[PDB]
Amino acid sequence: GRLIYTAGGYFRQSLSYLEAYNPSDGTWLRLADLQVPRSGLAGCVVGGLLYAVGGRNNSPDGNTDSSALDCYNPMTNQWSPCAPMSVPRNRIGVGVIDGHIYAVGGSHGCIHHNSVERYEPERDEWHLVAPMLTRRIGVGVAVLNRLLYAVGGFDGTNRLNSAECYYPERNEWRMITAMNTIRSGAGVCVLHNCIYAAGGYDGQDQLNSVERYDVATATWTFVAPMKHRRSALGITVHQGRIYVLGGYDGHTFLDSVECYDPDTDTWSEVTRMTSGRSGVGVAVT
Ligand SMILES: CC(=O)N1CCC[C@H]1C(=O)N[C@@H]1COC(=O)c2cccc(-c3ccc(C(=O)O)cc3)c2CSC[C@H](C(=O)N(C)C)NC1=O
Ligand SMILES: [Cl-]
Structure with a gap:
């Protein structure tokens, strides 16, 4: 059995929660908290x-952008620090190709990154790869056909409907068909050879x-909308279905x-998190 893990988030301040949902029985597990609270x-x-x-880490006495990479082992219920990225990246997008983590865009104070870096777990090292054509914070990332897609976001001036594709073998980015809607802080994932935003x-x-x-066909097509409007939502795929967790609707977390x-x-409400929050990190294992 696999679980849907939700890490961090924001509710009045950045959170340390690590919780796992079991879609087979509807239970939530409270796991070991992150060492440093984080949202985005x-x-x-x-x-x-x-x-x-x-x-x-947004705290009522100060905000700190994070360049950290932390590793949680479900067998030991322990977080371990890994090598940090070259720059702090808030509102980041992440994709995995061949067991390598790509950290895409994000912000560091007044800076909206176009830079992209790759982590090699076997060596515990980060290395920069070709930067994106556009600076993107709140970017959605999806891996499809061994290509890394960067979808939407905000470049510092405009929210984006554009999307681009990274070719790891060629070390290069190319613009693809733009979405029908401008989306910044969307949940982007892949299901049945399609990228969903x-x-x-x-x-x-x-x-x-x-x-x-x-x-x-290189086209974007609308499917059924969610019951709730949400930005900074968590997203993942489990047993052929998409799960969207939390987010912000303009007033509520x-x-x-x-x-x-x-x-x-069709969409359906399947469970509620133990508490409302936005800007969580989500994964399945
Ligand atoms: C104003 C502002 O951003 N806040 C004031 C200082 C703390 C900080 C704060 O409250 N952030 C928390 C956390 O939220 C994320 O983790 C988070 C994670 C990923 C992406 C995005 C995202 C960013 C920009 C845009 C875009 O503008 O195009 C769209 C999406 C967010 C921000 S979601 C908006 C909501 C908000 O503005 N208020 C006031 C509660 N922010 C949040 O939920
Ligand atoms: Cl934030």
Whole structure:
């Protein structure tokens, strides 16, 4: 059995929570807290280990952008620090190709990154790769066909509907078809050879619309929208379904967890998190 892990988040301040949901029985497990609270981080799994990458610790007495990479071992219930990134990256996007973690964009104070770096767990090292064509904070990242897609975000001036593709073998980025909607802080994931972009912020409101990119036709098509408008949501895929966790709807930090079934094109509320929060890092193992 696999669990959906949710790490960090924000509710009045950045959080340390690490909790795991079991879709088979609806139970939530309270696991060991992160050593440093963080929101706007991204989660991922490599070799059965959960990684929490970047983010920011917003505390009522000061904010700190994070360049940290922390590793959680489910067998020991222990977090261990890993080599930090070259720069702090809040509102980051993460993708895994061949057991290597790609940390994409994000912010560091007044800086909106276009830089991308790759982590090698076997060596415990980070190395910069080719930067994106566009600076992107709150970027959605998805791995499809061994290519890394960077979708939407905010470049410091405009929220984006554009998306680009990284070719690891060639070390280069290329623009792909832009989405129908401008989305910053959307949940981006891949399911059945399609990239889904759910929710986000279009510059005026949080979104409940969801669209998917078909690689064969290079088009984005809207599918059923979520029941709740949400930005800075967590997203993952489990047993052929998409799960969206928490987020912010413009006033409230959501506890709602929705599930998308692609066969019926429907969303449904499956559980609630123990408390409402936004900017969580999510992964399945
Ligand atoms: C104003 C502001 O951002 N805040 C004041 C200082 C602390 C900080 C604060 O409250 N952040 C917490 C955490 O949220 C994330 O982790 C988070 C994670 C990933 C992406 C994004 C994201 C960023 C920019 C845009 C875009 O503008 O295009 C869209 C999405 C966010 C921010 S979601 C907005 C919400 C907010 O503004 N208020 C006031 C509660 N922020 C949050 O939930
Ligand atoms: Cl933030």
